[PDB]
Amino acid sequence: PKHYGKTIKVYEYVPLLDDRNINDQGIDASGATIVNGNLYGSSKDIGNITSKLPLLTENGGRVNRVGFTRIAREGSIHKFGFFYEFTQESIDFDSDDGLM
Amino acid sequence: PVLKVMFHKDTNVATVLDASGSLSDGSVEVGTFHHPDETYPDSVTIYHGVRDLLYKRSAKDPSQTASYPNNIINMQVISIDMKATPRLILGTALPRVISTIEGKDVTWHVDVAGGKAPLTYKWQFKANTVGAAFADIDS
């Protein structure tokens, strides 16, 4: 549209289990704050996944908290053009009447 | 193991430490608890232990004790910082019974996670005879 500059932006929402999901909402299964809030992210390692499984006891509590993330994309437009010039004689006296 | 808990009044950060651990950041000692629990090892955890310890300390001054409603009970603003040794967990338990025949080779394997590395393994054998106790398998 008009009056919005030359750029368009859009959001992309990252999945929960993704390495791009970098956030500070993480609380592990024992209730301790952890550096990552995406559980095991994109990991496919069995050992890594096991140590980060959201296990839950019969007493519940503040355990296994997660966070989320999103990304923004953008692009812009540009301007182009060219021209050429001629005289009246270059049209009238030329052999080819279809020159233009 | 016994886990010592330190609390920082200004940052609402509860630090869990080994029994011999210590801090020098102004945090005060609020108590200690057994992890895993001796009577309910798999029904509670460090969060419940810290909550129980904090319930009996004053919100005005964590060094002093207090009763409800003048105690620390709002866990939503409490950050639990884990610095004690990770709990020792038996990842791959052995098969309760193995059946075979004479002349066959038998293999036992165990996977253990947590604890303070390095881990050490010691196997023992107990014969089926009456009154036989566990004896170390000579390495």
From Swiss-Prot, chain A:
It is found in: Virion. Disulfide bonds: none annotated. The keyword S-adenosyl-L-methionine does not apply. Keywords: Capsid protein, Virion. One of its GO terms (cellular component) is viral capsid. Its main location: virion. Assembles, to form an icosahedral capsid with a T=9 symmetry, about 60 nm in diameter, and consisting of 535 capsid proteins. This is Major capsid protein. It comes from Enterobacteria phage N4 (Bacteriophage N4).
